[PDB]
Design an enzyme around this catalytic site. Structure first.
Site, PDB file in Angstrom:
ATOM      1  N   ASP A 180       3.590  11.131 -26.969  1.00 50.83           N
ATOM      2  CA  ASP A 180       4.457  11.586 -25.904  1.00 50.83           C
ATOM      3  C   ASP A 180       3.761  12.768 -25.215  1.00 50.83           C
ATOM      4  O   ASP A 180       3.130  13.591 -25.888  1.00 50.83           O
ATOM      5  CB  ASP A 180       5.833  11.974 -26.453  1.00 50.83           C
ATOM      6  CG  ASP A 180       5.754  13.038 -27.549  1.00 50.83           C
ATOM      7  OD1 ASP A 180       5.235  12.748 -28.659  1.00 50.83           O
ATOM      8  OD2 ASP A 180       6.203  14.177 -27.283  1.00 50.83           O
ATOM      9  N   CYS A 214       9.140   3.732 -22.212  1.00 55.03           N
ATOM     10  CA  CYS A 214       8.774   4.647 -23.276  1.00 55.03           C
ATOM     11  C   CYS A 214      10.102   5.215 -23.736  1.00 55.03           C
ATOM     12  O   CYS A 214      11.042   4.440 -24.006  1.00 55.03           O
ATOM     13  CB  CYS A 214       7.776   5.719 -22.799  1.00 55.03           C
ATOM     14  SG  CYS A 214       8.004   6.308 -21.090  1.00 55.03           S
ATOM     15  N   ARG A 220       4.623   7.973 -19.786  1.00 60.93           N
ATOM     16  CA  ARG A 220       3.715   6.948 -20.275  1.00 60.93           C
ATOM     17  C   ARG A 220       3.900   5.633 -19.506  1.00 60.93           C
ATOM     18  O   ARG A 220       2.930   4.990 -19.161  1.00 60.93           O
ATOM     19  CB  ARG A 220       3.913   6.753 -21.787  1.00 60.93           C
ATOM     20  CG  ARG A 220       3.333   7.888 -22.642  1.00 60.93           C
ATOM     21  CD  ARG A 220       3.735   7.767 -24.117  1.00 60.93           C
ATOM     22  NE  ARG A 220       5.138   8.131 -24.360  1.00 60.93           N
ATOM     23  CZ  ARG A 220       5.690   8.179 -25.570  1.00 60.93           C
ATOM     24  NH1 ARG A 220       4.955   7.901 -26.649  1.00 60.93           N
ATOM     25  NH2 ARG A 220       6.967   8.514 -25.711  1.00 60.93           N
ATOM     26  N   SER A 221       5.145   5.263 -19.220  1.00 61.00           N
ATOM     27  CA  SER A 221       5.445   4.076 -18.413  1.00 61.00           C
ATOM     28  C   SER A 221       4.833   4.153 -17.008  1.00 61.00           C
ATOM     29  O   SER A 221       4.240   3.178 -16.537  1.00 61.00           O
ATOM     30  CB  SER A 221       6.956   3.849 -18.341  1.00 61.00           C
ATOM     31  OG  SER A 221       7.499   3.697 -19.652  1.00 61.00           O
TER      32      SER A 221
END
Ligand SMILES: O=C(O)COc1c(C(=O)O)sc(-c2ccccc2)c1Br
Length: 297
Positions: A180, A214, A220-221
């Site tokens: 993360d 995510c 992250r997406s």
């Protein structure tokens, strides 16, 4: 310029300033449905909401809300559904959305537990013999098989509309080693995983948009989607230098807030795209290189 730009930004070390400028320019649309009192328990994070204009509506009369955005990239001709990690009370809505939007693939970029905290409900079954039924949406979900690799896992699921008795195969792509607020191990690790999704057929125009998540559905997406889109764009034109990454990201942010969450995540996107261009432009070999470099065994 892309690679010339990247190395101009590295040279000065101005990644924070480049990233903040994007944050500054980013679109800001209302998220009024998301902020309705009756939806507070459908949102994982107070400050991460889908814009009303691009949100996914569930096909029920009762409450059509899910924290999910359609990222419809017109020039690229690819769409993505970016959503948060489903909550204990929204796993049924998640699979409803997957069903209604005719998605084939679900890309999960987070672990269920990260840094002591539960970033995502356990929304798919972990054993063949223990299938899930989501009573609120009348859907059944069964683990059909799983292929476990070193840093990612691919699961076959069967999704059933209990009302109609129709069933669909959903492919689940679970990246387990993307921290993360961090970046993947290498461009190779990331690209190896992206090409697995690509090669499954899940991104085909003949299917609904792939569901990417995510925990919040933006950091992250966002990173994953930027790189894939930039690669597709140059693929269509066979012209790496015709892609303006920051401009693509900005276009993406028209459809969901805060896509890409750190300066380094943006820097990684550049990395991943520059390296991925090698395959796009006719270097078969690099795909094998990524696979080796990723240590997937
Ligand atoms: O995907 C990432 O890199 C980070 O995603 C995350 C979170 C997490 O995974 O704990 S919390 C979070 C966030 C939540 C509210 C406002 C601003 C950021 C984001 Br954005």
């Amino acid at each position: 310029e892309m690679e010339k730009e990247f190395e101009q930004i590295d040279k000065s070390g101005s990644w924070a300033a480049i990233y903040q400028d994007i944050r500054h320019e980013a679109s800001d649309f209302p998220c009024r449905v998301a902020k309705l009192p009756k939806n507070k328990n459908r949102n994982r994070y107070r400050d991460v909401s889908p814009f009303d204009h691009s949100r996914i509506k569930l096909h029920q009369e009762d409450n059509d809300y899910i924290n999910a955005s359609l990222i419809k990239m017109e020039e690229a001709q690819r769409s993505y559904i970016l959503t948060q990690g489903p909550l204990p009370n929204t796993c049924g809505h998640f699979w409803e959305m997957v069903w209604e939007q005719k998605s084939r693939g679900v890309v999960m970029l987070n672990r269920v537990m990260e840094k002591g905290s539960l970033k995502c409900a356990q929304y798919w079954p972990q054993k063949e013999e223990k299938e899930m039924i989501f009573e609120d949406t009348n859907l059944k979900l069964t683990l059909i098989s799983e292929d476990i690799k070193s840093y990612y896992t691919v699961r076959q699921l069967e999704l059933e509309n209990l009302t109609t008795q129709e069933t669909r195969e959903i492919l689940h792509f679970h990246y387990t080693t993307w921290p993360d607020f961090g970046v993947p191990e290498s461009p190779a690790s990331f690209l190896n995983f992206l090409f697995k999704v690509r090669e499954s057929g899940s991104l085909s125009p003949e299917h609904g948009p792939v569901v990417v998540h995510c925990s919040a559905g933006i950091g992250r997406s966002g990173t994953f989607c930027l790189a894939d889109t930039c690669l597709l764009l140059m693929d269509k034109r066979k012209d790496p230098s015709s892609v303006d990454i920051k401009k693509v990201l900005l276009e993406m942010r028209k459809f969901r807030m805060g896509l890409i969450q750190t300066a380094d995540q943006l820097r990684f996107s550049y990395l991943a795209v520059i390296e991925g261009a090698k395959f796009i432009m006719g270097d078969s070999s690099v795909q094998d290189q990524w696979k080796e470099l990723s240590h997937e065994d």
